[PDB]
């Protein structure tokens, strides 16, 4: 019995050595490996394979998954393959072949009375996206991040208030008890930072104790070396992470002196290329140490036509500086800088900035991680062809270099990887479903925890759930007491220990952060180079081993026009 | 007017098809979202005019060509399908393959 | 350029690779159709197929997963049957077997 | 003192003799008691009788009512009266004459200064419908039933997944119990159905002692006699109700096989006409069996000019057959049959089928289960003329035949009669207040275990509540814990016995599903009959006693064009 | 180091002997007072004052206040006056200077690492408002208050019922019971009224132990003098509110004999005017009286030229009339009088009525009580030009006496003042921030209990939250256990000893009201007028000490077509 | 369609435009909200025409004039904000005094 190759990918999505491009883009993948064995894949429908006594068997609930994603096309950081996904208990438990084992060969996930079935036969299918950079500004966030594939977001604020406007920071013991009681509301993990400008240890313990599992330094509550001192000592010992927006200002040093100040110790450099903030010029050259974990934050990516323009009348409107007086256009010309924002993108191809996210709402797009990841990949390619580390006529390399960036590199990063941010046996069932035309811009289906939390749903009085119109809706594991099962509320180690959980009765299931102060660059998974970067002084040329490192920028993009209404 | 959830919702539908039929009268090759939206439309007026289940699964083949549309937009669009109130009473139309 | 388009390698696929094989001549005897699914234990399909039930006995047919065959009124087919594999257990369909074989 | 008969309606609603048009279909309720006292009618308003001392009495709360209706005209299957309806503690007290027993003659109904007004006169009243053929596929669909008029939704699933848009399964315990805390957050009362498919026992009891109140035998799992005897064996252990959607492939068997495995046990067969599943041409024979509560689905009811049309090309999309091959053309003609579709809507007049449900978003619109009820019966009004049952001028029998059909039967049929499904004595008050123009198409008040739920609601900083827009928005019986207090969670005996509520922290009332097993075709009220009915396995021609069954397919129906905006 | 008073108003928001413009209003106030230190004001954002060792101190969070609204130009019965507040677990802590005692002088506002920002410099900030004339007929009226600036509801009612429709009533214990419950879910404070109209006492305690903290007696339950009586004696025993409408048809006595029948007993009279309802022609005489709250609901105000036709034709639907018969004309005549709405205009700006409500969706519009306020303020100063008491070239006085009438006034009046109703050290911290030139209209931020709970939010994809379409929408503040933590559910006296709350399961915090029956007409905030007032029988002509009180309609107001889109 | 939260409030927003275009076609002054509306509008449909940003920051001044809205109207509208798809994505369009 014999099948062509056409046929086989038309019913059961594609195999070993087919290839597919990625949305609109210039990336195509190459189907690595398939875990099957040919011709006992399982479907299901009608007169199909799952069906009692065939492709599914007489187990109990203990003995089988709850679900199974079959026949999905995986994209990770390890791997780009064919296989099928079981979970249980809301957790990954295998990548396989799933079936009966009384009747089907080589089975690894059992299908019983207790499965459902999602049909993953011709779609994608990726860990959820995981953003560091979160300003909570307003909870509408929340659905946003969550539709663009976002499953996890850290970050600070206590709503639309002037120091959540500008910065990361949850401030003091009441706003941090507040937030991680709305954070039950929200269909996305969730983990808190702190504001950690004080020269007094006991301020910054205090705010870990009561619950959050970070501490953010940022120059609008001075970014000064005293300060940034207190919280990283407080940080190796409460072993939360510290997230840096350096004094562009150069008021109490210049960037020798912030990486003085920091002594070698572990930290997070948010908008490392520096528009989003930081020592003006050159603190893009904070990406050559090896305690230093840099991520971009987004209106940067890829560098366009469009980027100065918006963003020379981005800070004019956020700093009120008006261009009639010549200091403030010195100082528009400080934070904003064609050389840096195009080298940026280059330094992301070669794997020296590690991390992506939004800074949202706070010159960053919250439902746009995921979509300018792939578009610097994709200008990337057009631009310098295939990466060193490339094998094959496909972009595997340069794919599972950017995915990367938005999931298990954030997880490291924040000391939640033993929880999230990669498909792995043991963690969180947080998985995105993409139909391959619509990768990185609309999934198919976001799962939460085990449950579906929000999709694409038509018409709800009509005969099928195709008919239009087709908008993102929420789905159960979005409602009351099932969210509260599918979702984590991170926590520090002190705030666990003193019944943080307990006293502020919080009903969703809680995470504990580890070991956030062990990561180093080496560490970022495809995005551990440190290299020999200087910035010019006068010219904002940026060099590393004395070669100009810069890019074009774009006219036109993919993941864009042929995508959104407006 | 008493509306119904389902009938708050086809009006976000007529509003969609709006914004395309205004950008198709400018000249512009629509988009995946404008086209949805545009044949979706036109096939809920073709019921409140009477128009059979047979006759709009053939006509709605008609209403945007390849040549109004974006590169990939008629290989995005598969086939369309909405409901509407018929004469006699709610019914699915689906177009299949409706931008040649 | 189609968006998410596939590149498919040309060639084709072996199904069910070093398994045993039998072929059945089978006949519906019935007056309504019959249609039977990849995987089903084919011993124990609807009584109006008529067929050597006994070298059937532990086999499905050699088809793609997934696919059918069907059997109009009166129609006559030879088939390809392939043999179960795992445990060779064999639960459900018309309780015939019940356990192992 | 006198009053013409035309300014009494028009006062209080029509009396004993009185005819009312239904909506805009041909069907006519003559009013056939009236339970007040000339002269004695309670009215509220402005000068009005319900005031201290006068329609209102001195009683403390224990001995007056919560709620009254006033002057209602009451549609149930056991009469068409006008009467006052008296609510406490969320239940349905009386219907009778309400008022004040210091000063009024044969009170049954005391008000009292606890007791809300609901102004009924010139309204219908009946009963909460109960849909149960759901798929859990969106949450949506809950209140798209509610504002319907469906006020219990019996089904199974997940969310968007490949099982739920095929199947009513909620499978296994990890689901059951995440949909059973879902449910709490939905303002109707709930009941989830299990996977019922597998030949193992134990596989079903650990689904019923987790929750559901019912298993789904569905095709798409393998509807084979070995799945229905083990399904049954556990229906008939621990009083639950079986579903089926048999083997439409004849794979198995034919439909004297199912219907030989089913041996005479109690069961549910859902869409027995076979449309939506089951033995090609003939599961509609099903309804001729003593042990067999025979239901539709609602896309087949009517039959319409359009019917076949967008049933030919949703099987096409459902399966994904396509025109081109010959076998899935033949597939096509095999579940889809004019003969059948014809015959159904005869059967529904004749008492032969007793049920109408949705199949929501899977074959079948979930507002519309009420709405083609009574497109039904006017069709068969025209077409057949009077009942045999009819006595007068009126219509009233089959008014009663065809409400049982989404009320009281489907209630009998899955154990929850003691608690919703008619408007009597001691049951949970899930009322529908309409107008008569508007009847069975948009409800003007929608009340759950005695609090508003859902209503039209005109703008919000209107000096009054009727001006525009006036659209459906959620009341008081629809948040937080009024919701928990005001619905209820249907459970099996197994998880009640074993303190599954307790475990899983369910807010809502609790209630337990008994009298599954013992529940025949003769228990369905006004829809009992046995017909010896016959197809023909080449022409597909339905008859009973030799008698060809068929009808005509309407051009155009009434609750149709006149009132919806799409 | 000088700088201009131009320069400085526009960085730090007005001061002393600065004059603002009240949104379009012919309305101007006048700075009072400033609690600043030139030179020390503190201001937040890139390179500004409140930064680690700077404007922000070293001390732990029980030494720093959570919240700090800077440059606040506050507008409340006390004064106006420039100063910064601060806000300590949910509560106002001092209206005084922020910042760092370490190197600022005069700091009474201590600004921590537990302090988060409001930048308030050009703002207005108010207290929230009260309305005490709530008919709870659906649950969006929450929304659409809290988006005017009201915090605070209280009123009666149980969803849309003909009861509800008509009156601020919510009957008897379990209708109470349900809707403290329901009350959980909504983002204001709320206070419930009972059903009054009972001539057996023990029926209205059973009603107060249940948990309202007031009565309403209506005419429409029957407003007769032993139910007057009835209803008062209870309110004197348990420490709660009665309020009234009269009756209008004089059926039971004339103003006189109600009047006697309240025999100098404390309570809150509504729609004084009597258009809302009241003995005719002359409910207006009641605010003569020492014992009388006065308030007026807000269709009558201010008068204008479309008043009239839209009472004559909302009569003539809201009690069924119809213009065809005499006697009902001879009633639309009785309630709607152009002499008693154009005197109400100028008895609020003379201090005879004291307080302002909605009557929403009953004859009033629940987002209009502030707008319209302001509205009469205007057309007041516009007709009669300066008050007596006023003092400089300002608005001051009338400002301070109009807006007691929706913030302290109701809540004396409701025996909520220890809690809410103005901004005062130790009350909730219920804010409302305004821009100038919106004032009234549309805020900027509205604070529940220390939490931003409603806002207006841009596109929520946006690199910041200010670009279109900007609209109200609920943030974290609103949010599940962050929301119950920072409202507040009012209980009587009894209901709190009684343990109401734990055996209701209310998760919101719990304040009980007290003070109920001291409060008289001279305890009315700048509104304590007792003029001796007549109405003439024949031509209701309104008379105090003999002068003729009237006003001319407006035909254009401001805070009308500038603003609003519809 | 597909549609995402952030496209279904740009659908608020061009209905809004809607209002205004129409009354501003009988000659009406317009009021805040109105003018808010029709200006931002307006320059997503450049956005979707693919002009630049630039171009959008200086062709937003010339949409409304002091005459053709209400007293004070101006400046009440110090500038206007709005982000649309460009073909390079989105961007943010900030339009100073848009009227006068
Ligand atoms: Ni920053
Ligand atoms: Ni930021
Ligand atoms: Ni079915
Ligand atoms: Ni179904
Ligand atoms: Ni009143
Ligand atoms: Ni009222």
Redesign the pocket.
Same mark, same amino acid.
């Given at each position: 019995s014999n099948i062509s190759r056409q046929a086989y990918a038309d019913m059961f999505g594609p195999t070993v050595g087919d290839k597919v491009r990625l949305a609109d883009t210039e990336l195509w993948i190459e189907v690595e490996d398939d875990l099957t064995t040919y011709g006992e894949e399982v479907k299901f429908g009608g007169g199909k394979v799952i069906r009692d006594g065939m492709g599914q068997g007489q187990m109990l609930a203990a003995d089988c998954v709850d679900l199974v994603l079959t026949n999905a096309l995986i994209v990770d950081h390890w791997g780009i393959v064919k296989a099928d996904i079981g979970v249980k208990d809301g957790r990954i438990f295998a990548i396989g072949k799933a079936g009966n084992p009384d009747i089907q060969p080589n089975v690894t996930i059992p299908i019983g009375a207790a499965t459902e079935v999602i049909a993953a036969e011709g779609k994608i299918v990726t860990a959820g996206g995981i953003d560091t !950079?979160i !300003?909570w500004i307003c909870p509408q966030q929340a659905e946003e991040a969550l539709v663009s594939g976002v499953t996890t977001m850290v970050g600070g604020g206590t709503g639309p208030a002037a120091g959540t406007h @500008?910065?990361?920071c949850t401030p003091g013991p009441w706003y941090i008890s507040r937030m991680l009681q709305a954070a039950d509301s929200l269909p996305v993990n969730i983990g808190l930072l702190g504001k950690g400008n004080v020269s007094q240890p006991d301020a910054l313990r205090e705010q870990v104790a009561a619950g959050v599992i970070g501490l953010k330094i !940022?120059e609008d509550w001075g970014a000064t070396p005293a300060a940034i001192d207190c919280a990283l000592t407080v940080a190796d010992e409460m072993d939360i992470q510290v997230a840096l927006?350096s004094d562009t200002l150069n008021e109490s040093g210049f960037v020798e002196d912030t990486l003085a100040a920091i002594g070698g110790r572990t930290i997070h450099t948010? !908008?490392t290329e520096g528009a +989003? +903030?930081g020592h003006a010029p050159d603190i893009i050259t904070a990406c050559a140490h090896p305690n230093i974990l840099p991520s971009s934050?987004n209106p940067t990516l890829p560098y366009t036509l469009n980027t100065i323009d918006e963003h020379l009348d981005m800070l004019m409107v956020c700093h009120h500086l008006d261009p009639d007086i010549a200091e403030d256009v010195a100082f528009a010309e400080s934070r904003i800088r064609r050389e840096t924002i195009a080298a940026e993108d280059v330094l992301h191809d070669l794997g020296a900035f590690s991390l992506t996210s939004s800074?949202?709402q @706070?010159? +960053?797009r919250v439902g746009e991680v995921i979509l300018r990841t792939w578009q610097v990949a994709h200008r990337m390619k057009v631009q310098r062809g295939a990466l060193a580390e490339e094998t094959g006529d496909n972009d595997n390399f340069r794919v599972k270099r950017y995915i990367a960036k938005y999931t298990i590199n954030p997880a490291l990063t924040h000391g939640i990887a033993h929880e999230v941010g990669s498909i792995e046996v043991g963690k969180l069932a947080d998985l995105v479903v993409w139909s391959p035309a619509f990768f990185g811009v609309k999934p198919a289906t976001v799962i939460k925890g085990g449950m579906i939390a929000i999709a694409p749903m038509g018409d709800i009085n009509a005969s099928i759930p195709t008919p239009q119109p087709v908008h993102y809706r929420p789905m159960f594991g979005a409602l009351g007491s099932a969210r509260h099962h599918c979702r984590l509320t991170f926590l520090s180690q002190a705030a666990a220990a003193n019944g943080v959980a307990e006293r502020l009765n919080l009903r969703s299931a809680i995470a504990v952060v580890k070991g956030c102060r062990t990561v180093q660059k080496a560490d970022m998974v495809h995005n551990s180079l440190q290299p020999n970067i200087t910035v010019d002084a006068q010219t904002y040329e940026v060099r590393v081993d004395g070669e100009l490192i810069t890019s074009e920028p774009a006219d036109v993009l993919p993941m864009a026009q042929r995508y959104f209404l407006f | 007017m008493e509306l119904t959830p389902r009938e708050k919702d086809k009006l976000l539908l007529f509003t969609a098809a709006l914004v395309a039929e205004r950008r198709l009268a400018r000249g512009l090759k629509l988009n995946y979202p404008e086209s949805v939206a545009l044949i979706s439309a036109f096939i809920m007026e073709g019921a409140r005019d009477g128009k059979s289940v047979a006759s709009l699964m053939e006509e709605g083949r008609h209403v945007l060509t390849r040549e109004q549309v974006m590169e990939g937009v008629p290989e995005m669009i598969p086939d369309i399908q909405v409901e509407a109130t018929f004469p006699d009473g709610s019914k699915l139309v689906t177009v299949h393959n409706p931008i040649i | 350029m189609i968006p998410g388009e596939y590149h498919v390698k040309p060639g084709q696929i072996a199904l069910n690779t070093g398994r045993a094989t039998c072929r059945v001549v089978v006949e519906n005897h019935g007056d309504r159709p019959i249609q039977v699914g990849s995987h089903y234990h084919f011993a124990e399909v609807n009584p109006a197929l008529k067929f050597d039930r006994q070298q059937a006995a532990g086999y499905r047919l050699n088809i793609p997963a997934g696919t059918a065959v069907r059997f109009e009124p009166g129609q006559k087919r030879e088939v390809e049957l392939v043999a179960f594999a795992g445990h060779r257990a064999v639960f459900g369909f018309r309780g015939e077997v019940m356990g192992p074989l």
């Amino acid at each position: 019995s014999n099948i062509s190759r056409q046929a086989y990918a038309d019913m059961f999505g594609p195999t070993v050595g087919d290839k597919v491009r990625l949305a609109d883009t210039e990336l195509w993948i190459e189907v690595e490996d398939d875990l099957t064995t040919y011709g006992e894949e399982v479907k299901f429908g009608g007169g199909k394979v799952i069906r009692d006594g065939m492709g599914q068997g007489q187990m109990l609930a203990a003995d089988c998954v709850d679900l199974v994603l079959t026949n999905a096309l995986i994209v990770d950081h390890w791997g780009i393959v064919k296989a099928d996904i079981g979970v249980k208990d809301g957790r990954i438990f295998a990548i396989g072949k799933a079936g009966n084992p009384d009747i089907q060969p080589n089975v690894t996930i059992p299908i019983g009375a207790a499965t459902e079935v999602i049909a993953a036969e011709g779609k994608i299918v990726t860990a959820g996206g995981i953003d560091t !950079h979160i !300003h909570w500004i307003c909870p509408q966030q929340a659905e946003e991040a969550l539709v663009s594939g976002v499953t996890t977001m850290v970050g600070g604020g206590t709503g639309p208030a002037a120091g959540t406007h @500008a910065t990361t920071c949850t401030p003091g013991p009441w706003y941090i008890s507040r937030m991680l009681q709305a954070a039950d509301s929200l269909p996305v993990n969730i983990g808190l930072l702190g504001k950690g400008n004080v020269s007094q240890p006991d301020a910054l313990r205090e705010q870990v104790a009561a619950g959050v599992i970070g501490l953010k330094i !940022h120059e609008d509550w001075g970014a000064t070396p005293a300060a940034i001192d207190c919280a990283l000592t407080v940080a190796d010992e409460m072993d939360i992470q510290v997230a840096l927006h350096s004094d562009t200002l150069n008021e109490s040093g210049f960037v020798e002196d912030t990486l003085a100040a920091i002594g070698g110790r572990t930290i997070h450099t948010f !908008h490392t290329e520096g528009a +989003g +903030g930081g020592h003006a010029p050159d603190i893009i050259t904070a990406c050559a140490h090896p305690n230093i974990l840099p991520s971009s934050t987004n209106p940067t990516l890829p560098y366009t036509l469009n980027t100065i323009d918006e963003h020379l009348d981005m800070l004019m409107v956020c700093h009120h500086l008006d261009p009639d007086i010549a200091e403030d256009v010195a100082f528009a010309e400080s934070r904003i800088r064609r050389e840096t924002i195009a080298a940026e993108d280059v330094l992301h191809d070669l794997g020296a900035f590690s991390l992506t996210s939004s800074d949202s709402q @706070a010159m +960053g797009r919250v439902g746009e991680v995921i979509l300018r990841t792939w578009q610097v990949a994709h200008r990337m390619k057009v631009q310098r062809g295939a990466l060193a580390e490339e094998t094959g006529d496909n972009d595997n390399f340069r794919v599972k270099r950017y995915i990367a960036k938005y999931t298990i590199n954030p997880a490291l990063t924040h000391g939640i990887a033993h929880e999230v941010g990669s498909i792995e046996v043991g963690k969180l069932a947080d998985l995105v479903v993409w139909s391959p035309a619509f990768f990185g811009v609309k999934p198919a289906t976001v799962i939460k925890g085990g449950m579906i939390a929000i999709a694409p749903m038509g018409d709800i009085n009509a005969s099928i759930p195709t008919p239009q119109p087709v908008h993102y809706r929420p789905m159960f594991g979005a409602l009351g007491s099932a969210r509260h099962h599918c979702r984590l509320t991170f926590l520090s180690q002190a705030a666990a220990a003193n019944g943080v959980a307990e006293r502020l009765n919080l009903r969703s299931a809680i995470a504990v952060v580890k070991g956030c102060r062990t990561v180093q660059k080496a560490d970022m998974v495809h995005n551990s180079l440190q290299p020999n970067i200087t910035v010019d002084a006068q010219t904002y040329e940026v060099r590393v081993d004395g070669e100009l490192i810069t890019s074009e920028p774009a006219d036109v993009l993919p993941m864009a026009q042929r995508y959104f209404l407006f | 007017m008493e509306l119904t959830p389902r009938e708050k919702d086809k009006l976000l539908l007529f509003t969609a098809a709006l914004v395309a039929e205004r950008r198709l009268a400018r000249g512009l090759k629509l988009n995946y979202p404008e086209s949805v939206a545009l044949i979706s439309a036109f096939i809920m007026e073709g019921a409140r005019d009477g128009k059979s289940v047979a006759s709009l699964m053939e006509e709605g083949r008609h209403v945007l060509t390849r040549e109004q549309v974006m590169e990939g937009v008629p290989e995005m669009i598969p086939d369309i399908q909405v409901e509407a109130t018929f004469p006699d009473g709610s019914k699915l139309v689906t177009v299949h393959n409706p931008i040649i | 350029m189609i968006p998410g388009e596939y590149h498919v390698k040309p060639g084709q696929i072996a199904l069910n690779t070093g398994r045993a094989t039998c072929r059945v001549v089978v006949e519906n005897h019935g007056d309504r159709p019959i249609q039977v699914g990849s995987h089903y234990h084919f011993a124990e399909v609807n009584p109006a197929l008529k067929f050597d039930r006994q070298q059937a006995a532990g086999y499905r047919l050699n088809i793609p997963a997934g696919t059918a065959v069907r059997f109009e009124p009166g129609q006559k087919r030879e088939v390809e049957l392939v043999a179960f594999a795992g445990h060779r257990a064999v639960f459900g369909f018309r309780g015939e077997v019940m356990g192992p074989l």
